[PDB]
Design a protein around this ligand. Structure first.
Ligand SMILES: CN(C)C1(CN)Cc2ccccc2C1
Lengths: 300, 237
């Protein structure tokens, strides 16, 4: 189990760690988060008490370094940093644990939610979507736009998700116009899976990462990407059986975890009704359809 | 964006454009089988592609052979239409290719857009107008060449005959759409109107009778009368 210490908490902020969150008061003696499970990526995120605009946060993996949080009063946000002196870090953390100034990552033992939400997500792929190579961790916020969004303006602060576009030459083979637009199997299996992602695990990783950025930061371009990647699978007549089974599980846990009060903005009526009821895979997503129907029957 | 009453003069400016109407591409008769079930038999069709400024009609005849062994024919029809339009554009010299293609039914938008991906600078647009181009098969010479075709065939007509020698394209399009609206609302009466006087003929190279300016005004008035009536006859007013 690893630890992310905080130098201090000078401004009142709601802090998130994965799907958990807690309120910290202005200058409350708060010095970090302990007992963070090894083996998964994590995200630590922030919403200031004063400006609910700009949720923001950091993707990281404690196996890749010793990371901490320090408020910057000039830029006015909590910043993740890496500590390169391992002895200094161990010493800081042990003192803060002895004084019990740290919250405990509060995982229930029965609970596999975070694993299920992040199964295929890997830090190395996050870092290629979020390009900032001098840090081992990745910053995301509500406002960041995607590469595809920019093509329809600062390239350094973009989310470089894989561009998916159903009405493009990449997706449509000359002379297969109708075939390829109504059955996207070519685009899914040959173009994207074999050509671009290489395997379905990297595809699912980007899909899961896009969902989490949409949920945690209300990042609209990420929500668009999550829905596009779902629709590409569901609108393909030919999908490996193992991919459909896993997709059903992935989506199930995403729908289970989504705040009931955000379904209006984070869920696209058209995509979901099409995927569950009209598409080739309308009968291949049993778990997802059952939770969608019992939790958000209004959407459908 | 969409074409409507408000940007109607754009049709007659100097940017090349085409209307595409697919309503007569897939055409069927519905009949009973010996077993008392219902079946369709397809008949020849056509794509109606029209330059509203010049009157140039590119009538692509759709032979029934193109449906043989195919499923979901009403969906294919839209894609077949888009394939044929895209082939037409590619066959034209660059300086004759349209800058916009206006489809008369919104369901053609995605088919045409996908088939025209090679032409990013050609705008594909819908319209809010309820244009009467389906009544093109009420024009006897157009109907006759469609029904006689024994293979796929493109036939090139000027739907305005020689009208542009005396009137503007705006006025010619208004005349055309009035004639077609009439033929669509009451084919028999409309056709009675156009031929009642045996002394007015259709030149071999024309689609419509050789009316004088004054005779066209009478004709147009009669077509309006017909259209207003049928509208009463229909709603009782
Ligand atoms: C018979 N007329 C001379 C046309 C065909 N020769 C001129 C033209 C050009 C393009 C499309 C239709 C038409 C009609």
């Amino acid at each position: 189990m690893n630890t992310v210490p905080f130098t201090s908490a000078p401004i009142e902020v709601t802090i998130g760690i994965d799907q958990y969150s807690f309120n910290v008061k202005e200058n409350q003696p708060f010095h970090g988060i302990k007992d963070i499970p090894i083996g998964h990526v994590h995200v630590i995120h922030f919403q200031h008490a004063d400006n609910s605009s700009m949720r923001y946060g950091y993707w990281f993996d404690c196996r890749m370094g010793n990371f901490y949080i320090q408020y910057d009063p000039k830029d006015g946000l909590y910043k993740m940093m890496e500590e390169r002196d391992g002895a200094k870090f161990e010493n800081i953390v042990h003192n803060f644990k002895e004084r019990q100034m740290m919250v405990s990552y509060p995982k229930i033992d029965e609970d596999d939610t975070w694993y299920n939400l992040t199964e295929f997500v890997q830090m190395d792929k996050i870092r290629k979507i979020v390009r900032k190579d001098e840090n081992q961790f990745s910053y995301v916020d509500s406002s960041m736009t995607t590469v595809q969004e920019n093509e329809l303006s600062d390239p350094a602060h973009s989310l470089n998700y894989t561009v998916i576009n159903f009405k493009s030459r990449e997706a449509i083979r000359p002379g297969h116009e109708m075939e390829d637009f109504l059955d996207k199997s070519y685009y899914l299996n040959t173009v994207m899976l074999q050509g671009i992602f290489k395997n379905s695990s990297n595809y699912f990783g980007e899909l899961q990462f896009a969902f989490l950025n949409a949920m945690f930061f209300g990042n609209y371009g990420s929500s668009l990407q999550w829905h596009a990647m779902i629709e590409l699978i569901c609108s393909s007549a030919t999908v490996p059986k193992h991919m459909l089974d896993k997709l059903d599980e992935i989506l199930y846990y995403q729908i289970k975890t989504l705040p009931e009060q955000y379904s209006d903005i984070l869920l696209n009526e058209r995509v979901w009704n099409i995927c569950l009821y009209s598409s080739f895979q309308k009968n291949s997503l049993h778990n997802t359809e059952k939770i969608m129907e019992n939790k958000y029957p209004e959407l459908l | 964006g969409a074409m409507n009453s408000s940007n109607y003069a754009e049709l007659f400016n100097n940017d090349i454009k085409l209307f595409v109407d697919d309503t007569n591409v897939y055409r069927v008769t519905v009949h009973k089988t010996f077993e008392g079930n219902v079946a369709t038999k397809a008949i020849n069709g056509c794509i109606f592609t029209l330059n509203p400024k010049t009157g140039h009609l590119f009538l692509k005849i759709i032979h029934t052979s193109v449906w043989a062994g195919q499923k979901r024919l009403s969906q294919l029809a839209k894609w077949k239409t888009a394939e044929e339009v895209s082939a037409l554009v590619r066959s034209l010299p660059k300086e004759e290719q349209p800058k916009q293609i206006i489809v008369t039914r919104k369901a053609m938008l995605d088919p045409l857009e996908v088939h025209m991906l090679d032409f990013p600078n050609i705008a594909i647009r819908p319209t809010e107008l309820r244009l009467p181009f389906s009544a093109a098969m009420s024009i006897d010479k157009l109907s006759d060449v469609v029904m006689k075709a024994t293979e796929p065939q493109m036939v090139l007509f000027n739907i305005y005959d020689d009208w542009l020698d005396r009137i503007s394209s705006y006025t010619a399009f208004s005349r055309l759409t009035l004639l077609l609206r009439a033929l669509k609302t009451n084919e028999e009466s409309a056709k009675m109107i156009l031929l009642s006087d045996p002394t007015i003929t259709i030149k071999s190279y024309h689609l419509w009778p050789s009316f004088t300016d004054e005779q066209w005004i009478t004709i147009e008035s009669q077509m309006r009368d017909l259209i207003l009536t049928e509208y009463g006859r229909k709603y009782n007013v």
